[PDB]
Design an enzyme around this catalytic site. Structure first.
Site, PDB file in Angstrom:
ATOM      1  N   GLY A 124       0.665  -1.288   0.000  1.00 44.09           N
ATOM      2  CA  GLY A 124       0.000   0.000   0.000  1.00 44.09           C
ATOM      3  C   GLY A 124       0.694   1.343   0.000  1.00 44.09           C
ATOM      4  O   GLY A 124       0.050   2.351   0.292  1.00 44.09           O
ATOM      5  N   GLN A 125       1.981   1.395  -0.319  1.00 42.76           N
ATOM      6  CA  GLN A 125       2.665   2.684  -0.332  1.00 42.76           C
ATOM      7  C   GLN A 125       1.907   3.545  -1.334  1.00 42.76           C
ATOM      8  O   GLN A 125       1.403   3.034  -2.335  1.00 42.76           O
ATOM      9  CB  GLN A 125       4.123   2.522  -0.757  1.00 42.76           C
ATOM     10  N   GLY A 126       1.801   4.843  -1.067  1.00 43.16           N
ATOM     11  CA  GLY A 126       1.038   5.696  -1.957  1.00 43.16           C
ATOM     12  C   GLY A 126       1.645   5.576  -3.331  1.00 43.16           C
ATOM     13  O   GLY A 126       0.930   5.459  -4.326  1.00 43.16           O
ATOM     14  N   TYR A 154       3.327   3.058  -4.197  1.00 45.75           N
ATOM     15  CA  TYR A 154       3.068   1.647  -4.486  1.00 45.75           C
ATOM     16  C   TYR A 154       1.624   1.118  -4.455  1.00 45.75           C
ATOM     17  O   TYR A 154       1.382   0.011  -4.940  1.00 45.75           O
ATOM     18  CB  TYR A 154       3.945   0.765  -3.587  1.00 45.75           C
ATOM     19  N   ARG A 155       0.662   1.861  -3.911  1.00 48.21           N
ATOM     20  CA  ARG A 155      -0.702   1.327  -3.894  1.00 48.21           C
ATOM     21  C   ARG A 155      -1.359   1.430  -5.275  1.00 48.21           C
ATOM     22  O   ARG A 155      -2.392   2.071  -5.469  1.00 48.21           O
ATOM     23  CB  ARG A 155      -1.527   2.043  -2.833  1.00 48.21           C
TER      24      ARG A 155
END
Lengths: 667, 85, 165
Positions: free
Chosen positions: C56-58, C60-61
């Site tokens: 979920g990294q911004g 990475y999401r």
């Protein structure tokens, strides 16, 4: 910032102070409590329900309960002291110790340091070692609690004895080494950790006026570290404990009160306390502990309530499940259980009521007749295990309605405790209270308090103008002491040993001391007020029939009074114009016109108006005190000036202080 | 002016934002404000500036205000947390 | 067989549920990152169901926005220690379910909370009921029973989610 959910557990009978404990058991601990009928019990709260363990037989009222252990073993032996003897149970229903310790009345506090046993009494203090008397002390005032510093982290056993007269006598053997002074009568005290303080030894006390402290008792002197003197948190500390609930790494202070308030104090300043979470309970807390009892893995606080509701405050949420239209199911389970129980109990009690009516209950009221010092008003506090229906107040926070007729107070809905103020004048000695609970026979119990004809302190100032007064002739010292108990608020009933006693009183309405010294047949009642010695003369002459002036003292008392009357008159003068100025405030926004003088009132209008509500009582009290002072200071010379009062009333309506003192000295 | 080819961005007292790049490169100066733009803010790809009259400021290196207004009152110091070009 | 997808909030590290949500044969003691693409069989509150895992990294999401359309059954999760990084997880269902593929099939669609043994939380439902997002009604589920790492409550919205399959 901290949140604790109120999860309730088993309900036991009415409990005294510090009658709950937690067996140390990493999973859920076990709770042990003692009812006023002697039924000491313990449970574990496995899953929702209390799995009771060794619920014993009824006996005397359990006055104290403490768990300890002989060696450094995990302490598990639970000792109680019901009527006059100390019984002891293991961590199960096997009684092993029964020390009779034949005494007169009862036990009020006790401490178990391995084999050493320090018990209190009304006045007596004993230190036994395995049913063998080794130390015996007889204080002059009733004892509230006894503790002994850790005999392991230190070397000598130094028992501390908390007396009713605001002192902690840190005695060794059978004689006091020294006495620490504390504000308010101490009620609880316990070393403020699982060991007794890192830096050697530390004693943490809590008083009945509402005050905490950390007296560090060294070999010869105390080292005060901090104090938690409160303003809004009034209420007698009945219990205190140390436990790390916040989880920062240093143990926090879980402190109870007498008005339900449970408080957690964190030491985030690394040396001083700070409040973190407070919660009211509608009854009087009697014991507090940390740890966990339900759903191991979440630290919680266990709080013993006066009526017996052993409540917990957990750090774990309650809304475990949330699906569809929903309203959890444990609420439904508890609802169904209470439904069934109330049905069957209604059946039984209805049949028994029928039998009783066709064939046609004592209880406890924990009352507390204390004296507020910041004011001049006693604050009576009744408590009943059940709910009250109506309280009579006959004489000679509250949600109740007035009982005025002799005041009758009805208590709405389901309230246990009732706090009501009572303000009595410097004279007029002579108060009953009928309490009725919401039980079926609806009985009533009467209490008789006394409004004495002055809060006792430890020192006076002799450089004041003392208007001494001497009583002489044919006294038994016990009888003269009985007179002084009839005449003074806070004095022990039992005549103190030595046939020579001195007390240092102090008027709370305005600071004027009343040193009282007396021997087997003589008495000196020095004072700073003419009113006090006049009242003493009259009341002591009355007791007898039953069975000097410093010419500047009046000046001193009038100089004492002057600021109060000045403040009352300024109060009236400002509140007269508050509303008139407020009518001008609503227009033109007050940018350029209002005088700064009245601008100083436009802000504090609220406080002025809320003090004006109480002003007239203070003004009437001041006028009465001044007229009594005048009448008495003329009565000592042998005159009767009961007629010049109206001129004095007019002068006070004017209140020219210099003309006032002139009228005092002249006529 | 964080361009990866180092095009510096400067803000005028007048509120007109200039685009003076490396060694004072000549670029059109964007006047992309109505009020004073005293709210410039880096965004991790472009140079965020804040509109003076309660308007969120969005913009790229070629004048075009990328963002619409998003602030109710006058902001004072933007920033941005961590994500890529 | 019946898969399960979970995403999570940014800047948390709150992805360590799937290990303790897996069986007892291969339990993992390290923190389990929500890398996604996980392949395993785990006995759930209805049967031995399957799973899927994402990050979920911004920045990475978006790989979770690359596997969002599919899944036999479904999955709900959130970060209930987030007092600022839970505004952004509000749109995440509109990224997840608002998409046409998710809406078309009546399988399992619920979002649950987390981090209960942590010193902040909110409503049990959290994703579909606390943060004003009660409007997930046409989605054929509801989600509940959350703790932090100690391993509780995966059978909490199970009648709405797990035993609903």
């Amino acid at each position: 910032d901290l949140n604790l959910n109120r999860a309730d557990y088993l309900q036991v009978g009415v409990t005294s102070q510090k009658t709950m404990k937690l067996l140390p058991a990493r999973a859920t601990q076990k709770v042990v409590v003692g009812d006023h009928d002697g039924i000491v019990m313990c449970f574990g709260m496995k899953k929702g329900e209390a799995v009771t363990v060794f619920k014993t037989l009824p006996g005397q009222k359990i006055a104290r309960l403490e768990l300890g252990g002989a060696l450094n073993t995990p302490q598990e032996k639970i000792f109680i002291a019901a009527g006059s003897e100390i019984r002891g149970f293991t961590k199960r229903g096997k009684q092993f110790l029964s020390f009779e310790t034949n005494l007169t009345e009862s036990i009020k506090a006790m401490h178990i340091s391995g084999s050493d046993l320090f018990l209190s009494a009304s006045y007596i203090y004993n230190h036994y070692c395995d049913c063998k008397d080794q130390h015996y002390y007889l204080s002059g005032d009733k004892i509230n609690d006894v503790i002994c510093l850790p005999v392991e982290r230190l070397l000598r056993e130094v028992p501390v004895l908390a007396c009713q007269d605001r002192v902690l006598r840190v005695l060794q053997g059978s004689d006091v080494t020294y006495e620490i002074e504390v504000p308010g009568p101490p009620t609880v005290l316990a070393l403020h950790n699982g060991n007794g303080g890192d830096s050697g030894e530390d004693l943490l006390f809590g008083t009945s006026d509402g005050k905490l402290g950390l007296i560090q008792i060294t070999t010869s002197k105390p080292i005060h570290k901090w104090e938690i003197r409160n303003e809004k948190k009034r209420g007698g500390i009945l219990c205190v404990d140390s436990f790390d609930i916040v989880g920062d790494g240093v143990k926090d202070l879980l402190v109870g009160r007498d008005d339900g308030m449970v408080e957690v104090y964190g030491f985030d300043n690394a040396n001083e306390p700070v409040l973190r979470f407070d919660h009211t309970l509608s009854e009087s807390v009697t014991s507090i502990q940390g740890g966990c009892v339900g759903k191991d893995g979440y630290d919680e606080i266990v709080v013993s309530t006066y009526s017996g509701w052993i409540t917990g405050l957990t750090t774990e949420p309650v809304h475990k499940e949330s699906g569809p239209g929903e309203e959890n199911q444990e609420m439904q389970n508890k609802i169904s259980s209470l439904r069934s129980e109330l049905e069957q109990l209604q059946y039984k009690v209805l049949q028994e009521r029928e039998k009783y009516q066709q064939s046609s209950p004592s209880f406890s009221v924990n009352d507390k007749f204390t004296l507020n010092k910041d004011d001049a008003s006693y604050s009576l506090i009744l408590e009943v295990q059940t709910a009250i229906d109506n309280v009579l107040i006959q004489s000679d926070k509250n949600s109740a309605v007035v009982s005025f007729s002799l005041a009758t107070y009805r208590c709405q809905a389901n309230t246990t405790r009732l706090e009501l103020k009572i303000r009595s004048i410097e004279g007029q000695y002579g108060l009953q209270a009928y309490v009725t609970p919401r039980i079926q026979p609806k009985t009533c119990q009467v209490r008789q308090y006394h409004i004495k004809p002055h809060q006792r302190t430890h020192f006076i100032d002799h450089d004041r103008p003392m208007n001494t007064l001497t009583l002489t002739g044919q006294f038994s010292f016990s009888e003269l002491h009985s007179w002084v108990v009839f005449c003074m608020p806070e004095v022990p009933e039992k005549p103190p040993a030595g046939e020579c006693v001195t007390f240092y009183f102090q008027n709370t309405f305005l600071d004027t001391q009343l040193e009282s010294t007396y021997r087997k047949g003589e008495g000196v009642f020095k004072s700073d007020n003419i009113s006090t010695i006049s009242i003493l003369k009259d009341v002591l002459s009355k007791e007898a029939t039953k069975r000097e002036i410093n010419e500047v003292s009046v000046k001193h008392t009038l100089k004492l009074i002057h600021p109060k009357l000045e403040y009352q008159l300024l109060l009236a003068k400002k509140v007269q114009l508050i509303d008139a100025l407020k009518e001008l405030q609503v227009h033109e926004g007050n940018t350029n016109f209002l005088i700064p003088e009245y601008r100083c009132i436009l802000e504090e209008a609220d406080h002025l108006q809320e003090e004006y509500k109480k002003q007239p009582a203070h003004l009437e009290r001041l006028y009465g005190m001044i007229t009594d002072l005048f009448i008495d200071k003329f009565k000592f010379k042998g005159t009767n000036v009961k007629t010049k009062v109206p001129l004095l009333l007019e002068i006070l309506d004017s209140y020219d202080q210099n003309a006032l003192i002139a009228f005092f000295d002249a006529a | 002016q964080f361009d990866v080819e180092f095009r510096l961005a400067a803000a005028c007292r007048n509120g007109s934002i200039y685009i003076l790049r490396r060694d004072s490169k000549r670029p059109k100066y964007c006047i992309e404000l109505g009020a004073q733009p005293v709210g410039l803010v880096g965004v991790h790809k472009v140079l965020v500036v804040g509109s003076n009259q309660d308007s969120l400021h969005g913009f790229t290196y070629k004048g075009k205000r990328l963002w619409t207004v998003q602030m109710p009152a006058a902001i004072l110091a933007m920033n941005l947390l961590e994500q890529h070009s | 067989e019946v898969h399960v997808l979970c995403l999570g909030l940014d800047n948390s590290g709150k992805t360590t549920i799937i290990n303790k949500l897996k069986p007892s044969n291969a339990q993992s003691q390290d923190i389990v990152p929500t890398i996604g693409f996980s392949i395993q069989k785990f006995k759930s509150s209805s049967l031995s169901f399957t799973v899927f895992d994402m990050s979920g990294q911004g920045r990475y999401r978006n790989l979770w926005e690359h596997y969002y359309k599919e899944g036999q059954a479904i999955i709900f999760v959130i970060d209930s220690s987030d007092k600022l990084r839970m505004v952004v997880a509000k749109e995440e269902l509109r990224t997840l379910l608002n998409h046409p593929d998710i809406k078309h099939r009546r399988i399992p669609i619920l979002f649950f909370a987390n981090k209960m043994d942590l010193r902040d939380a909110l409503t049990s439902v959290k994703v579909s009921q606390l943060l004003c997002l009660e409007d997930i009604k046409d989605k054929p589920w509801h989600i509940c029973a959350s703790d932090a790492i100690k391993g509780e409550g995966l059978q909490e919205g199970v009648d709405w989610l797990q035993d609903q399959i």
